[PDB]
Amino acid sequence: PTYTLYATFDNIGGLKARSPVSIGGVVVGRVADITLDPKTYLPRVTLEIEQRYNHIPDTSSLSIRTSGLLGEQYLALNVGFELGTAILKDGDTIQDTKSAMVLEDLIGQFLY
Amino acid sequence: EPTYTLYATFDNIGGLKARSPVSIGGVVVGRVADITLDPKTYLPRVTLEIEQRYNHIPDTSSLSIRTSGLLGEQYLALNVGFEAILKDGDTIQDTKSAMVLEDLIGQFLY
Amino acid sequence: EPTYTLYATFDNIGGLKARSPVSIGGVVVGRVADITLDPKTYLPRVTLEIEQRYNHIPDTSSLSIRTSGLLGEQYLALNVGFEAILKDGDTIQDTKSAMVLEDLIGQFLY
Amino acid sequence: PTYTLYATFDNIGGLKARSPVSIGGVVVGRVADITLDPKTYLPRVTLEIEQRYNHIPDTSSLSIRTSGLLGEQYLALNVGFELGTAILKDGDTIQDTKSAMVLEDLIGQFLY
Amino acid sequence: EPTYTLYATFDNIGGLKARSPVSIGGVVVGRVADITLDPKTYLPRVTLEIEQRYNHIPDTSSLSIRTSGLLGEQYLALNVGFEAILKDGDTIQDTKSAMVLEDLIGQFLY
Amino acid sequence: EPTYTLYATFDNIGGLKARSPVSIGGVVVGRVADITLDPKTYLPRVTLEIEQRYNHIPDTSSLSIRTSGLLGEQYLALNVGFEAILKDGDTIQDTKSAMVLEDLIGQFLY
Ligand SMILES: [Zn+2]
Ligand SMILES: [Zn+2]
Ligand SMILES: [Zn+2]
Ligand SMILES: [Zn+2]
Ligand SMILES: [Zn+2]
Ligand SMILES: [Zn+2]
Ligand SMILES: [Zn+2]
Ligand SMILES: [Zn+2]
Ligand SMILES: [Zn+2]
Ligand SMILES: [Zn+2]
Ligand SMILES: [Zn+2]
Ligand SMILES: [Zn+2]
């Protein structure tokens, strides 16, 4: 089966349900759900990771990225370091997350 | 399906159309109900319908017209303001218009 | 579609064609009725039809040919000037032409 | 009917038969033929212009351009000035011509 | 398709998939047989099959993940090193990973 | 349909394939008959067939692999040399390889 993880972002961009979660480009999981937290109004992503990937630290990072230039958006799981480190279990939360870039802001940067 | 109405005036709506999605942090929370030029000012007035369960939106919140991906569809990004709450029929004052390719090129070049 | 006719001469119309939309602030308020080179000046004269309900457009208003998105179709942006009102058969003197990629590249490089 | 004009380029790029010839973006003619001159190995373009466009000077220019960013290639006819000036007739040649840009050279410029 | 097996570990395979082409100087000489994360290191290990007639590839050779055109599919470019020959079951140590757009933009901007 | 054969070795042919067009000044004058890695050098050897009526091509001429438009197909541009003539079976020494996106990005960035 699979085990559940939670990750909150400021902006998920083009992320949707059944979006792939990948390590080093290799798909190891899928985005199960996306829901705005009622108090913080921040996108909370519920992901399901294949059970055979057990040794993922809680220091690991999630970055929302895009395949190619115009392709679909996905979650890149950067394997964390192993200082007391704890492995991610079912129902745990990945604290270190990077949000999706916004074209207008990137242009805002490049121009101004 | 229950919703409350909000109004937002822009200088340029760009590719915005009816049923365009209104999203917070990329998550769709509403839809563009109508778009109409104000009879007096000739400025685009956008009429939005927001899902009722998203009630706690301050009036300090911002609206920015953006594009999904590089070539995708145009949408309204609702930037949540810091913490008066917006009710049915209220107006969001702080709005950002849609980018214009010619103007961006005009900026980059000249 | 009750409309009134307007004329606008450009140096270059670019991708403009018949039935091209004329928009104010992104809101379509009219259509490109015809495009024809003036017999005397060999400059593109564009014949536009604007919806009758948008009457209060001053003659100080401008027309700029722009593109929807990056690769989309070309359209006429009518910039409403500040304030004589434009009537049926009048001519918009102030026009901005369509950009040419080769020239943009020529600029960017040289 | 139509009248014929000839224009030699160094490189025609994506130009082909039945390609549009336009003034100020308005199509006024079509590319009838393209053939390499046997001695000079330069692309010679034979164009046909609608008869009703009579007052085109021989000082006019032809530039091969592209519609949009990825669209098809066409001939932009820049109306010449009217100094003894002669109008273009059937079988005449447009001397002032600009060739089609090459992506590799443009990149070569931008980089080096 | 008589072939011999090779292994190559990357930090990121990007768009690489099964049946992805392995090419020398643009000429396809093999195929990506499999891709699997090493159980111990959690790093992508790519299993390649190279056509038997290309035997004289030294072990100093390099693998770089590249893209055909601008938007095309991703492939493995095998750069033949100058001159021990690679056999069936060997491992290419020298590998260059697939670029990430976000990082490229991050570089270009910052 | 009559043709004479020419050979050209590159470091990288890129997207070149069989039946790729060989053009002078954009005008197609020949086709890529075959592509094969040299057994000794592991370098792409391109076998071209040129229409017989284009006989007067000097051996000082150059071959450059280019792309049609921005996203179009890959082709061989034959740059006519200044004024020994190339015959059937001769080899063009001066060749330019196909650009690599990663290398161009590598150049632009680093
Ligand atoms: Zn669970
Ligand atoms: Zn451990
Ligand atoms: Zn309401
Ligand atoms: Zn409150
Ligand atoms: Zn009328
Ligand atoms: Zn008035
Ligand atoms: Zn004739
Ligand atoms: Zn005259
Ligand atoms: Zn094997
Ligand atoms: Zn050896
Ligand atoms: Zn032969
Ligand atoms: Zn000679």
Swiss-Prot record, chains A, D:
GO cellular component: plasma membrane
Full-sequence range covered: 38 to 152 of 183
Residue numbers on the Periplasmic membrane side: 1-112
Chief subcellular location: membrane
MF GO annotations: phospholipid binding; phospholipid transporter activity
Membrane topology: Single-pass type II membrane protein
Ranges for region MCE/MlaD: 2-79
Complexes and interactors: The complex is composed of two ATP-binding proteins (MlaF), two transmembrane proteins (MlaE), two cytoplasmic solute-binding proteins (MlaB) and six periplasmic solute-binding proteins (MlaD).
Keyword field: Cell inner membrane, Cell membrane, Membrane, Signal-anchor, Transmembrane, Transmembrane helix, Transport
Family per similarity comment: Belongs to the MlaD family.
Subcellular localization: Cell inner membrane
Disulfide bonds: none
Its biological purpose: Part of the ABC transporter complex MlaFEDB, which is involved in a phospholipid transport pathway that maintains lipid asymmetry in the outer membrane by retrograde trafficking of phospholipids from the outer membrane to the inner membrane. MlaD functions in substrate binding with strong affinity for phospholipids and modulates ATP hydrolytic activity of the complex.
Highest rank taxon of the organism: Bacteria
Protein name: Intermembrane phospholipid transport system binding protein MlaD
